[PDB]
Enzyme design. Structure first.
Site, mmCIF file in Angstrom:
data_model
loop_
_atom_site.group_PDB
_atom_site.id
_atom_site.type_symbol
_atom_site.label_atom_id
_atom_site.label_comp_id
_atom_site.label_asym_id
_atom_site.label_seq_id
_atom_site.Cartn_x
_atom_site.Cartn_y
_atom_site.Cartn_z
ATOM 1 N N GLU A 145 4.848 8.530 -3.929
ATOM 2 C CA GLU A 145 5.662 8.027 -2.828
ATOM 3 C C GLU A 145 6.582 6.902 -3.282
ATOM 4 O O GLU A 145 7.085 6.137 -2.451
ATOM 5 C CB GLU A 145 4.776 7.578 -1.666
ATOM 6 C CG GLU A 145 4.041 8.734 -1.013
ATOM 7 C CD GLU A 145 3.186 8.301 0.156
ATOM 8 O OE1 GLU A 145 3.174 7.092 0.472
ATOM 9 O OE2 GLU A 145 2.526 9.174 0.758
ATOM 10 N N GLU A 166 0.839 -1.193 0.000
ATOM 11 C CA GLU A 166 0.000 0.000 0.000
ATOM 12 C C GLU A 166 0.878 1.248 0.000
ATOM 13 O O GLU A 166 0.626 2.212 0.729
ATOM 14 C CB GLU A 166 -0.971 -0.001 1.182
ATOM 15 C CG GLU A 166 -0.329 -0.222 2.538
ATOM 16 C CD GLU A 166 -1.335 -0.130 3.668
ATOM 17 O OE1 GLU A 166 -2.470 0.311 3.404
ATOM 18 O OE2 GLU A 166 -0.996 -0.499 4.812
HETATM 19 C C1 LIG Z 1 -5.890 11.316 5.682
HETATM 20 C C2 LIG Z 1 -5.078 12.587 5.951
HETATM 21 C C3 LIG Z 1 -4.111 12.367 7.117
HETATM 22 C C4 LIG Z 1 -3.077 11.287 6.780
HETATM 23 C C5 LIG Z 1 -2.288 11.624 5.503
HETATM 24 C C6 LIG Z 1 -1.259 12.705 5.759
HETATM 25 C C7 LIG Z 1 -0.798 13.474 4.698
HETATM 26 C C8 LIG Z 1 0.142 14.459 4.910
HETATM 27 C C9 LIG Z 1 0.638 14.680 6.192
HETATM 28 S S1 LIG Z 1 1.822 15.828 6.810
HETATM 29 C C10 LIG Z 1 1.628 15.215 8.390
HETATM 30 N N1 LIG Z 1 0.774 14.262 8.425
HETATM 31 C C11 LIG Z 1 0.185 13.906 7.267
HETATM 32 C C12 LIG Z 1 -0.777 12.907 7.018
HETATM 33 N N2 LIG Z 1 -3.218 12.017 4.429
HETATM 34 C C13 LIG Z 1 -3.104 11.492 3.190
HETATM 35 O O1 LIG Z 1 -3.879 11.833 2.319
HETATM 36 C C14 LIG Z 1 -2.021 10.511 2.877
HETATM 37 O O2 LIG Z 1 -0.908 10.956 2.681
HETATM 38 N N3 LIG Z 1 -2.310 9.183 2.825
HETATM 39 C C15 LIG Z 1 -1.417 8.127 2.543
HETATM 40 C C16 LIG Z 1 -0.086 8.330 2.199
HETATM 41 N N4 LIG Z 1 0.727 7.325 1.944
HETATM 42 C C17 LIG Z 1 0.323 6.070 2.006
HETATM 43 N N5 LIG Z 1 1.219 5.041 1.730
HETATM 44 C C18 LIG Z 1 -0.989 5.774 2.346
HETATM 45 C C19 LIG Z 1 -1.438 4.340 2.415
HETATM 46 C C20 LIG Z 1 -2.766 4.061 3.118
HETATM 47 C C21 LIG Z 1 -1.449 3.667 3.789
HETATM 48 C C22 LIG Z 1 -1.871 6.806 2.619
HETATM 49 C C23 LIG Z 1 -4.287 12.989 4.707
HETATM 50 C C1 MTA Z 2 1.785 2.272 5.128
HETATM 51 S S1 MTA Z 2 2.812 3.638 4.542
HETATM 52 C C2 MTA Z 2 4.014 2.697 3.566
HETATM 53 C C3 MTA Z 2 4.815 1.768 4.463
HETATM 54 O O1 MTA Z 2 5.817 1.073 3.716
HETATM 55 C C4 MTA Z 2 7.084 1.289 4.256
HETATM 56 N N1 MTA Z 2 8.052 1.295 3.186
HETATM 57 C C5 MTA Z 2 8.161 2.207 2.171
HETATM 58 N N2 MTA Z 2 9.136 1.947 1.351
HETATM 59 C C6 MTA Z 2 9.705 0.802 1.846
HETATM 60 C C7 MTA Z 2 10.790 0.012 1.425
HETATM 61 N N3 MTA Z 2 11.515 0.299 0.344
HETATM 62 N N4 MTA Z 2 11.096 -1.071 2.148
HETATM 63 C C8 MTA Z 2 10.369 -1.357 3.227
HETATM 64 N N5 MTA Z 2 9.335 -0.695 3.719
HETATM 65 C C9 MTA Z 2 9.044 0.379 2.988
HETATM 66 C C10 MTA Z 2 6.974 2.613 5.013
HETATM 67 O O2 MTA Z 2 7.981 2.686 5.977
HETATM 68 C C11 MTA Z 2 5.551 2.514 5.574
HETATM 69 O O3 MTA Z 2 5.528 1.721 6.731
#
Ligand code: A1BV5
Ligand code: MTA
Ligand code: A1BV5
Ligand code: A1BV5
Ligand code: MTA
Ligand code: MTA
Ligand code: CL
Ligand code: CL
Ligand code: CL
Ligand code: CL
Ligand code: CL
Ligand code: CL
Ligand code: CL
Ligand code: CL
Ligand code: CL
Ligand code: CL
Ligand code: CL
EC number: 2.1.1.320
Lengths: 625, 302, 625, 322
Positions: free
Chosen positions: A432, A423
């Site tokens: 990301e 995810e």
């Molecule tokens: C829902 C809101 C609060 C959390 C988060 C957020 C964004 C920016 C900042 S700056 C300080 N804290 C925050 C928190 N956000 C998002 O939209 C988001 O980034 N989701 C997200 C990113 N990477 C991921 N791998 C996932 C996967 C499901 C695991 C989800 C808005």
């Molecule tokens: C649930 S947000 C994505 C998750 O994956 C982990 N993650 C992202 N990139 C990597 C990677 N290259 N190897 C292992 N874990 C990762 C992050 O540390 C976070 O826990």
């Protein structure tokens, strides 16, 4: 309920009047700080030396009352843009006088009207006043939704109302504000008090006020219909507009006298309260995101940074998402292991980026639900969350789960995997670096292995929001490029904005990417048909993802997964707003760039006008590998 | 049981006392176990007696034959007696008189008094009968690392702390402690051991892995050897008439040395820290070591 | 009551322990995030690959609990400044690990100890950790008030405690902090947790911690005496120190086990609560200024700017001041009009800078009390307050008061005045240009007229406050000189600071100034004997003023007018702190400069070391004429 | 991190003493590895790592021709613009004797292992251009008994006083960054109007090959400089010495400076605030070499007689890219 106010141009005694409007139920009062008819001279004697006082004393109310309950009003005789030079100078002086007295009182807001196309000198005086004092004031610009000239009764025999389609003319009022707002350099202390007439205009005129900083909506008692009993009510279209405004959380200002003399004056306001309380009560998503609305946040980089415990806690409190993941894993298990092999075949299943282990529990539930064996690996680079994972593994999971504390690009796994589950998706899908991580992890995936998600696609849509543009502009910081805040994205629950065209796909990634010449950089050209007049300020970004077959997740509004609150949309701003006329096409370009260490986005508008290429060489925003 | 084996001590008859702590996970507690079958250790099911304590144990020692003295993380000193024909381990007393983790205890020659060293920089002398503290000395400037009673005088004992001081005590003096430093700015001492026969001589290990032999009256470092790569955690002499010296370290190795500190036997068998070691009274060629890898290893020594 | 905390190095089960310390009455808990004895290896195998978990799970408490109630503690085995290279690197890694886990938990504070002179590598690692993450942490540095080496019992026969006067050695502990604090570039996220032993040192050692950012004071159970009943109590000097700390509003941390076994563990804390509640309850001044303590404000310029209504409201809610003004006017009236002339002689009395008319009412009361006739003028340039003045005049005063709405330098009065009365004084006496205004007003004063006030004198005193220095440093703004914040004064209720020498007069002005060659510029050289070791950060400024004869006002602490809350002291900072050893003299220079339009101050330290000349040509701070 | 321009290399090449020393070192090493009876039966493999426009290649050719031994040359260079020059040289003059490799020495998978690796990746502060990391990444294609030229290098620091250079550094303030970032970065400069306050002392030292199992190029060094004058500290001058082979050495340390060698100027580490130093006091400075996966940087701080701020923490003002 509604935060309401009462507008009056007649206040014989301020204490009695404020007490009365408090009894009627209002929360604040708009009133003149000088008498409306009390025109004053500043240049020419003898009226120049008029003996004082010039208005009431500030002792009549408490400082708290001035700070909270009173909204000033510019006297209607002040015309800073008169064609007469004498009146011009005198009104300059008078407007400065009234603004400075309102600041001396510490009023939270002050009302000035926009009644014509030319408010240039008015804007000059107001901008000066803003940039002089040490005050903390707010300025509400009274703008009519329909100009009085276009709302008059056709009762002038020799000057009839032109019954001809005038698309841009019907929007003239907005242009008024837009010019004024522009002359004052997009000041954050200048907002809109939108006044509403009896005849509502076309829907595009009402849409012209989306994304605008509306702090107040003004309702005259004239626009209220009467029902059987005698209460004052509003028409269906007026009610639709009232609901639209209620979602923008504006303050409502009642103006005009009571024409429903049988009822009380709190009846008009009670009708607003009844419209408010009898609206669809808030669902879980809106409850959670109510406070996040139009709040700019820098995007997370879970690869570059180790996320804190409560960020993961936010990620985990989302049942719909993990239900979808469980369903995808369930279907994949059934599609890979026939019923006769259920005990002779145990699938190897690696969660890449496991966090605190919600995907692990979901995989366990999927296997237990599908009646198949699985061997679990929980790969996670963040050691702080690996602590949680290992406590889980010792206490509850057992040796079924093997916790791996390393990078998935680095980890040399003992066996290859049937299914890899991740995810790593951001608000913009790939923002990301999920593609790079899964690319580095592809070597321990079996020759016929499955990746969940298997596909993901980002979506872009041009938007207009002079509010979010002003927020981004306010994000300027010392010790960096004064315009760096425009060359970086922001994760935000977009709220006060206007979608100018349908979202279209930007970048798409597949997993596994068997391709020999792997290259995750991208160059995409998008053309957005715009059938309205508007001002481009940025591009909203969403994503969709195929986890397995027809199990999908989406934050794209048209196909949004219902009640899923893990992602907010992303926003790519632009330095300079771009005027867009009806019929024109907004052509934008987007790049995904990378080297050994960084990955970033560049973007540019190429039509109808060209913008600068934003974030070149990732100077303002990079994503670490 | 708990994962981290901290203490291992042989009784006169050959039974094995074990003290363990849990240094990770939900609960940070400790436990005491007695094995009349020493080869069945660590396994809990095949033990003679056992007990769970409130908090983890840092150091342990016998009080003769039926008593067990415990330095607790709680800041307390606990005395536990063997009861019901050595099937129970009941708490005789548990006094909270230190202000921080008690890191070391040592029983004096009489067997009725003891001495404890804690991280509160204080050293204390205990009467094991009255269950009260006789004297409380604040001699050091940093947390006390080790205290070691002289084998035959219960007014004399050594103590080393992380203030880089090695004190020889004599409770019969109005200023009891005496600083007896080797050379000048030596690395921090960590473990102390008197010599069994040759009195007025002892050995100490430092945090760098060097084991040093020093005579009190001569107060000059006659010899020292770089045995371990990391800090030296413990030193135990053998019951031989010509005693062997067992050295324990955080490099996860056991070493056995002669009287001139030359390497005779070396064991990499432990894959985590080596914490304690005791020689068998029955067989003077068998040495039992315990470590944080939860292993109880029995070495044969040529 | 006291905001307290409990320090523990033994936590078998975190939930039970937190519940117990909550029942005991504490507000927060300091505890280790890893087991104190659980030393870990990072470089050398095999212990490198130790199977996890490495500590407890973060699920054991709620995120709110981690955010509010838990204070982390660095494991005592971590020695980043060991003489051994191996231990050095390993402790670097371990300290980074524990700090990052504390940040992952979102703890409000984290404790690290200062036990020796050399904490350079520790400071390097901590500064790095501060400058890496996106966290919002705070770091409490545990510093002993007396080093353990200087607190040991003299029981080492061959290494006795030197019973010789060691003035600078007894302060060594402070130097520790001061070096660490300096290496980390005066970080705002690094404060002091001052630990207190049984033997208290000399008073100058305790004074060495004035002005330092003390967030916590640590009390071991050892330092508590026992009374008749068995309660734990503290000695008289310990109680004095506790009161001094209570005024700094620090948090108190209890450490060590309970040695008063008959009583409960809440007895130690109850004694602190008893000391707190049985202290002199707050008087009016401290009540008002409690929230203003160490709050930097830019000085007002009532000549350049028109003050708001509530600023005047603050000015007027001060009875002692206007009582003194009334008394001065009363005495002057009696001294100018003999009893036989009481009806034949009516005095002319002009309030120059009248505001909303408190001085006018005071003059009326003075005349009514002295049985003499007066004719009042109320001169005020601020028209917003002239509104209040004229409402007062119409409603209550009558034609006795003549309200003049103009500048006193400009106004061409009809008759000359017997008495002119003003309150144009700032915190630094002349810093609001009272001299220039009264100079311009002197021409309508009679040849034998009186000015109230007749004299005023500013006072300066060198102070030390690494807290206020850090605040001033934090006042850096975009679009100006990066060090402009140090070249301007601030009106502030100085609180956490140390007076390094007695205040001495700076500039003095008399009124009327009959002198032919009038010149209000000044050059003053002050020498301050300093009989302590300290670090100069700025100069506090006060004033005294003679209204008439022996009726005076003063904010100079030694002669401060009791219960007068109209002025706070002023603070002139300096760019670079200046070390000052005991016996040295701090020599400072102060200029008052002016041209046609601006007036400003320049200042410089000339001894023991030289500073830069601050605010040259008024580049960072001017006062408009 | 960057590909040097043609005229920078031209400056590097117009330095005869330096390449004479390199030629002498290679000559001695050739004689010490191949006995006289094996002169025709033994051909040495010799890789120039960081070859530029090929001065070290010509020097190696001259060394072999002077020592009467056979060599097979590789010319490894990552800068493709200089690889153009190398390949024109190889086609026109060198011939198949030289094999030009256009890749990173950390990446390159060589066909055979090398007898001698030769580099000049040294900066004014010896390791400030990441010679250790590059040679570490190149160590795997060095034979079990192979030689690295240079074999050793050591950086030197010396406290200096120069209110002129301090003012220049102060004038280096730029918009869009930390107003004091110019003090937290080094500068290569021909120090002129300055005063040496104490004798230079060694800072960091690196050996090649570094056979060590637990390779770690980070450093923490504490230096004490006796000052027998009254002065005002403004920064620290940095020099280096290097052992190419046995007793053939290069040096920009003034006391042992190689005569008439103009490839390196000294380096200068400034400090934000000048520090008064009275006669008899000792200036105690601390220096760190730090790194992660992508960056390498220096931190430094004065601890005596007064403490300074730790300069360039987390490489915020100055990093060296890997
Ligand atoms: C829902 C809101 C609060 C959390 C988060 C957020 C964004 C920016 C900042 S700056 C300080 N804290 C925050 C928190 N956000 C998002 O939209 C988001 O980034 N989701 C997200 C990113 N990477 C991921 N791998 C996932 C996967 C499901 C695991 C989800 C808005
Ligand atoms: C649930 S947000 C994505 C998750 O994956 C982990 N993650 C992202 N990139 C990597 C990677 N290259 N190897 C292992 N874990 C990762 C992050 O540390 C976070 O826990
Ligand atoms: C008491 C505190 C609050 C008010 C005021 C203050 C300072 C700075 C700012 S910046 C925004 N508001 C403020 C308010 N203050 C002062 O010490 C002060 O300036 N007194 C003062 C100045 N000029 C004078 N002529 C007089 C005469 C008695 C009339 C008094 C601190
Ligand atoms: C002599 C002067 C001019 C050239 C050069 C310099 C410095 C900074 C800048 S900024 C724009 N141009 C320049 C040029 N310089 C040096 O001291 C120097 O850096 N030498 C050097 C570095 N890296 C090396 N691997 C070597 C090895 C011999 C090859 C040598 C000062
Ligand atoms: C009570 S704060 C000082 C008062 O004097 C007024 N004041 C200051 N300078 C002048 C001036 N030159 N003429 C008239 N009023 C003044 C200010 O506007 C304020 O009300
Ligand atoms: C003569 S300056 C150092 C030379 O070595 C080259 N160089 C530096 N690092 C490497 C590397 N890792 N691989 C190949 N060439 C390198 C540079 O590009 C330059 O030509
Ligand atoms: Cl008010
Ligand atoms: Cl960890
Ligand atoms: Cl492309
Ligand atoms: Cl643009
Ligand atoms: Cl949490
Ligand atoms: Cl007015
Ligand atoms: Cl002068
Ligand atoms: Cl200065
Ligand atoms: Cl090329
Ligand atoms: Cl290091
Ligand atoms: Cl500094």
């Amino acid at each position: 309920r509604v935060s309401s106010g009462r507008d009056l141009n007649c206040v014989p005694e301020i204490a009695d009047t404020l007490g009365a409007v408090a009894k009627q139920g209002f929360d604040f009062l708009c009133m003149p700080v000088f008498h409306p008819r009390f025109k004053r001279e500043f240049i020419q004697e003898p009226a120049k030396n008029r003996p004082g006082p010039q208005t009431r004393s500030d002792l009549l109310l408490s400082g708290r009352d001035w700070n909270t309950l009173i909204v000033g009003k510019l006297s209607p005789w002040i015309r800073p843009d008169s064609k007469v030079e004498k009146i011009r100078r005198n009104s300059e002086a008078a407007m400065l006088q009234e603004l400075n007295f309102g600041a001396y009182l510490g009023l939270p807001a002050f009302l000035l009207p926009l009644n014509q196309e030319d408010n240039t000198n008015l804007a000059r005086v107001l901008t000066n006043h803003i940039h002089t004092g040490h005050h903390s004031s707010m300025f509400w610009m009274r703008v009519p939704l329909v100009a009085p000239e276009d709302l008059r009764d056709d009762i002038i025999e020799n000057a009839p109302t032109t019954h001809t389609e005038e698309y841009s003319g019907e929007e003239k009022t907005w242009m008024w504000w837009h010019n004024f707002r522009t002359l004052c350099d997009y000041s954050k202390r200048i907002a809109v008090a939108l006044e509403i007439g009896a005849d509502l205009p076309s829907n595009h005129v009402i849409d012209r006020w989306l994304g605008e900083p509306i702090k107040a909506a003004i309702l005259p008692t004239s626009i209220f219909l009467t029902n059987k009993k005698g209460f004052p009510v509003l028409s269906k279209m007026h009610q639709r507009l009232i609901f639209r405004l209620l979602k923008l959380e504006v303050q409502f200002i009642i103006t005009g006298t009571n024409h429903h003399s049988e009822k009380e004056f709190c009846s008009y306001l009670q009708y607003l309260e009844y419209l408010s309380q009898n609206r669809p009560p808030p669902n879980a998503y809106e409850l959670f995101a109510k406070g996040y609305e139009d709040y700019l946040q820098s995007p997370l980089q879970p690869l570059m940074d180790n996320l804190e415990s409560q960020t993961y806690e936010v990620f985990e409190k989302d049942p719909i998402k993990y239900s979808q993941y469980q369903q995808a894993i369930y279907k994949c298990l059934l599609d890979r292991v026939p019923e006769e092999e259920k005990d002779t075949n145990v699938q190897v299943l690696m969660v890449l980026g496991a966090g605190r282990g919600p995907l692990v529990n979901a995989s366990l539930r999927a296997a237990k639900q599908a009646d198949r064996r699985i061997k679990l690996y929980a790969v996670e680079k963040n050691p702080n969350a690996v602590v949680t994972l290992e406590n889980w593994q010792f206490e509850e999971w057992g040796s079924q789960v093997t916790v791996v504390s390393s990078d998935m690009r680095e980890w040399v796994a003992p066996e290859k995997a049937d299914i890899i589950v991740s995810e790593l998706l951001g608000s913009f899908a790939d923002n990301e670096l999920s593609p790079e991580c899964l690319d580095g992890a592809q070597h321990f995936l079996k020759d016929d292995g499955v990746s969940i998600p298997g596909e993901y696609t980002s979506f872009l849509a041009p938007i207009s929001s002079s509010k979010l543009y002003n927020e981004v502009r306010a994000c300027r910081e010392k010790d960096r490029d004064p315009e760096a805040q425009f060359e970086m994205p922001y994760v935000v629950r977009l709220h006060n904005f206007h979608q100018l065209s349908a979202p279209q796909p930007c970048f798409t990634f597949s997993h596994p990417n068997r391709d020999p010449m792997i290259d995750n950089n991208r160059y995409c050209t998008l053309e957005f048909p715009v059938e309205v007049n508007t001002v481009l300020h940025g591009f909203a970004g969403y994503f969709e993802t195929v986890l397995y077959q027809d199990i999908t997740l989406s934050i794209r509004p048209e196909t949004h997964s219902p009640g899923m609150f893990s992602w907010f949309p992303i926003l790519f701003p632009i330095k300079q707003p771009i005027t867009v006329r009806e019929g024109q096409t907004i052509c934008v370009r987007f790049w995904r760039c990378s080297n050994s260490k960084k990955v970033w986005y560049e973007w540019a508008v190429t039509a109808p006008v060209c913008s600068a290429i934003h974030n070149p060489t990732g100077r303002s925003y990079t994503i670490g590998l | 049981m708990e994962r981290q084996l901290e203490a291992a001590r042989y009784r006169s008859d050959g039974a094995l006392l074990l003290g363990a702590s849990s240094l990770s996970g939900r609960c940070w507690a400790g436990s005491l176990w007695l094995f009349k079958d020493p080869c069945a250790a660590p396994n809990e099911g095949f033990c003679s007696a056992g007990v769970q304590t409130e908090a983890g144990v840092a150091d342990l020692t016998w009080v003769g034959e039926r008593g067990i003295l415990v330095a607790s993380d709680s800041g307390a000193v606990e005395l536990w007696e063997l009861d019901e024909n050595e099937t129970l381990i009941v708490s005789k007393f548990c006094k909270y008189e230190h202000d921080d983790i008690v890191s070391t205890v040592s029983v004096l020659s009489s067997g009725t008094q003891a001495v404890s060293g804690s991280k509160d920089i204080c050293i204390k002398v205990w009467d094991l009968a009255q269950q009260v503290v006789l004297s409380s000395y604040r001699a050091h400037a940093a947390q006390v690392t080790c205290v070691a009673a002289s084998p035959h005088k219960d007014s004399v004992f050594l103590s080393c702390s992380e203030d880089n001081r090695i004190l020889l005590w004599d409770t019969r003096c109005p200023k009891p402690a005496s600083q007896i430093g080797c050379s000048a700015p030596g690395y921090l001492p960590t473990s102390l051991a008197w010599h069994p026969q040759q009195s007025e001589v002892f050995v100490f290990g430092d945090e760098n892995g060097t084991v040093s032999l020093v005579d009190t009256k001569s107060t000059s470092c006659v010899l020292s050897s770089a045995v371990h790569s990391q800090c030296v955690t413990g030193l135990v002499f053998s019951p031989h008439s010509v005693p062997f010296l067992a050295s324990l370290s955080e490099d996860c190795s056991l070493a056995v040395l002669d009287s001139s500190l030359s390497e005779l036997f070396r064991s990499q068998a432990h894959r985590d820290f080596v914490r304690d070691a005791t020689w068998s009274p029955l067989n003077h060629s068998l040495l039992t070591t315990v470590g944080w890898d939860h292993q109880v290893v029995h070495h044969v020594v040529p």
